[PDB]
Amino acid sequence: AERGELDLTGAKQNTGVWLVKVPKYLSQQWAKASGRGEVGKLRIAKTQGRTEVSFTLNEDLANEHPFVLQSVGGQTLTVFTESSSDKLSLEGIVVQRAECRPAASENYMRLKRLQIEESSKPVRLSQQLDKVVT
Amino acid sequence: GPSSQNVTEYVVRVPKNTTKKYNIMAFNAADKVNFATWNQARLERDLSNKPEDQPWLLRVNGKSGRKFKGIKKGGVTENTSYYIFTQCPDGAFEAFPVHNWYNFTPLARHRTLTAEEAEEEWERRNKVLNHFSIMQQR
Amino acid sequence: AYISVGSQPSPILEFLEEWSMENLEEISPAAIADATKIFVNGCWVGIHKDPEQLMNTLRKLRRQMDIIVSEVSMIRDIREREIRIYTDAGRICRPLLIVEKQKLLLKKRHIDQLKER
Amino acid sequence: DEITPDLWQEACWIVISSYFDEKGLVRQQLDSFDEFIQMSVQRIVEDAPPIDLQAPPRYLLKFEQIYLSKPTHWERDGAPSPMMPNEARLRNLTYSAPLYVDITKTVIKEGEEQLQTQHQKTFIGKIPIMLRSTYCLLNGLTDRDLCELNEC
Amino acid sequence: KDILCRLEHTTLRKVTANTAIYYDPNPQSTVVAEDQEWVNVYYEMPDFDVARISPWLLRVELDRKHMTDRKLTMEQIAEKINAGFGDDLNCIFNDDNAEKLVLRIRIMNSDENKMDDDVFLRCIESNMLTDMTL
Amino acid sequence: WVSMLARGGQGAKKSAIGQRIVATLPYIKQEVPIIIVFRALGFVSDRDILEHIIYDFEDPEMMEMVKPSLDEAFVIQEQNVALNFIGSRGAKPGVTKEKRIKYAKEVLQKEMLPHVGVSDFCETKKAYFLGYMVHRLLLAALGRRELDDRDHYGNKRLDLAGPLLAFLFRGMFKNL
Amino acid sequence: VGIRFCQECNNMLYPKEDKENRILLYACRNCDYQQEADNSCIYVNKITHEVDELTQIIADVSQDPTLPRTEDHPCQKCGHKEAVFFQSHSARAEDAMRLYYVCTAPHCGHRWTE
Ligand SMILES: [Zn+2]
Ligand SMILES: [Zn+2]
């Protein structure tokens, strides 16, 4: 028991968690909701020899997100948290990796075009003066 | 059976703020880490610079166990986000953003040639003989 | 011949991250062998496991002028498993007619429209 | 529909004609200069670290935005006037545009009081202007207008 | 053509298929059955090496085509290696009838009876391939 | 520059090991062995360094190419020792070890591969790129990849008025 | 021929013999770790190095538009008629004019030499 000691109860419990990368719009919508209590529902469909994972955006939030799994054998990922009370703890070990991709093919690029425009909004460039400053 | 056509649906929850920040700890697959042997673990900030803008230092089972040094990920996820899903009895998935990404690399615990002593071995630039015997003297 | 004036690789990097490109800081070195390295302006940004789809998507974007400007070079070295993207100035380029399925995408309607330039 | 070989020769030179109707022949020169004025000059000024003075009062200077006016010539009496390229050739002048920058000056006097003043459009020098570039006087002038200025 | 061969420089590298170094603790069961067929014959009534022998073995495979082109003989190569290194090394070679030409090389028995015993054999391997003249 | 020494040198030790790879970093008088640079970046174990240079350990031909380089830097087995070694050759002599290590980190942080990164967290990015340079050198030495052509205009850039003028303006504005 | 790293400090393992047991061992320099050797071959040097180029070929080359395609060499595995052929163009061979074929059928990266 010490300040620098790390709690390993989560690891001893063999806790399994999933690591998922999500786009900005999905995260931005969740940030916009400010954590009202729900942002969507994750649906998992398993067949005789295949597994399908997808996420559905909340209808209220909007006013499909198929999930692609990735092999975890390439790395050992574990989640550790730093509590505000200065008590580090190990949440668990990542057991699956997934990635979120959009459903729209071409119309999505229109959103990106605006996003690139938004990103380039504060990019200042030289201005032309009709008259010489006096 | 049901598994051949099993369908599962769970809710997603995004709490506004959490008392404890979430980070990512990564180890090389070839490192062959074993959490079972992790009887004790100590995570403290490194003292090489001499706080939040410095690398981490991980020590397992004190000096006896393997020592790892953590380094914050240089890349910035300005256009990307990382979340962790944790199973809960209620069955509604919870997503927690990762504050930072850290990569931990093991540190060797053995007599290492000192910088002053390495100068002496530099005279034997390529005339070194029986590389094994070098550490025997040390 | 035209000499590229250059543009920021930020829109290309952001799209690559959004696309299924694994960052270089997050992967393990063992995964690099099978995947193809992605270079943007000479900086190794990451790796991709589906180079053929990525190149088709990149080519489609540049032709539609969506995220990739016209003067951006997308080179896939199939043998070397590398995709090099260039956005800087000083690159010499020339306009070429695109061919798909042994057919010019340039049709009579384009010529007729140009005739009344 | 599809360009038959009997019409390709006309079709291909219609394409080449439209390219030169738009690009011209010195596009690489003009586009490169336009990028330098529009983007590079602003980026260089922005990328410059703020100047911090401390020797007590602390002064900070930040160069915000760049302005460029038309190529101007000043008579010996001090009256500015637009500089036509032909006048520059005849009178051996340099075809240059005045360069102005917005500078913000914030001073900290250790009294927990911060005074911020902006010097809008501070003259910092003259940039030679490439002819017929976006910042040249001849830019956007019809062929008739160019002749009135004794320009080919 | 006889004069041509007598002039054109030929080093062991030219007519060598590959070189491998094995620990080879027991000379009898040297590496694999292929060497077992003919290695025993030399070891049934061996001479000048019954006293001792170095553990490390340097096995050399010689290309048949290259050897035939220059009309080189295994006995001559062994004599040439013996002449260059004297008794420092022991050379054992198979008969020309075998489809594969092999030449086992070891270090003097007296030394076995300071740098290293495996690195030194590596130095000889490079030394024989390039410097040694056949 | 990442260079592989020629085999012209004759020696029992030099010939046996093979050709070693050295790196010519900016602001350093003398060539620095490549494995030292990786150590200075924060990669000490040979497995870690080789993972950034060789992406497929199943290939034995490439592994043997880097072995002579590993032996050259076997003396240096710590990041701080490697940093001191690079600092010893720095642009200005280091009065004390602490200055040498700080100077060496300064060069690697910003003066070495600046396009890869110029921050303090870019060591991993530079290790991968530096390993790619070593990997590219190995392919050329192994004959698996053709040597680059200086006359190729893919490998060329034309500096026009803009980039030319911008280069001048950066110096003048700094003077201003 | 193989390369090993000690499980302790993940440094290069170099061969070594023990006189007491007369058995090949792999020992780490900076670690003192030792391991039983199973290959028994310290290293093999291939002067000819007739490495099968088929291994070096990448099945993705079938997607190259600049490579020639022939329908006269059907794939031996899937029987697809179209195949792409090319030369090694690999240095250190000292001679290379033979063609290497790669099946153009997707998901069948079969490669062969006629
Ligand atoms: Zn070790
Ligand atoms: Zn096939």
From Swiss-Prot, chain A:
GO terms for biological process: positive regulation of transcription by RNA polymerase II; transcription by RNA polymerase II; transcription elongation by RNA polymerase II; transcription initiation at RNA polymerase II promoter. One of its GO terms (molecular function) is RNA polymerase II general transcription initiation factor activity. The modification Phosphoserine is found at S126. Keywords: Acetylation, DNA-binding, Nucleus, Phosphoprotein, Transcription, Transcription regulation. It is found in: Nucleus. The modification N6-acetyllysine is found at K21, K32, K121. TFIIF is a general transcription initiation factor that binds to RNA polymerase II and helps to recruit it to the initiation complex in collaboration with TFIIB. Heterodimer of an alpha and a beta subunit. Interacts with HTATSF1 and GPBP1. Interacts with URI1. Interacts with GTF2B (via N-terminus); this interaction is inhibited in presence of GTF2F1. This is General transcription factor IIF subunit 2. It comes from Homo sapiens (Human). The chain holds residues 2 to 150 of 249 of the full protein.
Swiss-Prot record, chain B:
The modification Phosphothreonine is found at T114. Transmembrane segments: none annotated. Signal peptide: none annotated. Phosphorylated on Ser and other residues by TAF1 and casein kinase II-like kinases. Induction: Up-regulated in response to enterovirus 71 (EV71) infection. It is found in: Nucleus. TFIIF is a general transcription initiation factor that binds to RNA polymerase II and helps to recruit it to the initiation complex in collaboration with TFIIB. It promotes transcription elongation. Belongs to the TFIIF alpha subunit family. Heterodimer of an alpha and a beta subunit. Interacts with GTF2F2, CTDP1, TAF6/TAFII80 and URI1. Interacts with GTF2B (via C-terminus and preferentially via acetylated form); this interaction prevents binding of GTF2B to GTF2F2. This is General transcription factor IIF subunit 1. The gene is GTF2F1.
Swiss-Prot record, chain G:
The keyword Plastid does not apply. Its main location: nucleus. Zn(2+) 1 binds at C6, C9, C28, C31. Disulfide bonds: none annotated. A zinc finger (C4-type) spans 6-31. A zinc finger (TFIIS-type) spans 71-113. It comes from the Eukaryota. Keywords: Acetylation, DNA-directed RNA polymerase, Metal-binding, Nucleus, Transcription, Zinc, Zinc-finger. InterPro entries: DNA-dir_RNA_pol-M_15_CS, Rpa12/Rpb9/Rpc10/TFS, Zn_ribbon_RPB9, Zn_ribbon_RPB9_C, Znf_TFIIS. It is found in: Nucleus, Nucleolus. GO terms for molecular function: DNA-directed RNA polymerase activity; nucleic acid binding; zinc ion binding. Zn(2+) 2 binds at C75, C78, C103, C108. GO terms for cellular component: nucleolus; nucleus; RNA polymerase II, core complex. GO terms for biological process: maintenance of transcriptional fidelity during transcription elongation by RNA polymerase II; transcription by RNA polymerase II; transcription initiation at RNA polymerase II promoter; transcription-coupled nucleotide-excision repair. Belongs to the archaeal RpoM/eukaryotic RPA12/RPB9/RPC11 RNA polymerase family. DNA-dependent RNA polymerase catalyzes the transcription of DNA into RNA using the four ribonucleoside triphosphates as substrates. Component of RNA polymerase II which synthesizes mRNA precursors and many functional non-coding RNAs. Pol II is the central component of the basal RNA polymerase II transcription machinery. It is composed of mobile elements that move relative to each other. RPB9 is part of the upper jaw surrounding the central large cleft and thought to grab the incoming DNA template. Component of the RNA polymerase II (Pol II) complex consisting of 12 subunits. This is DNA-directed RNA polymerase II subunit RPB9.
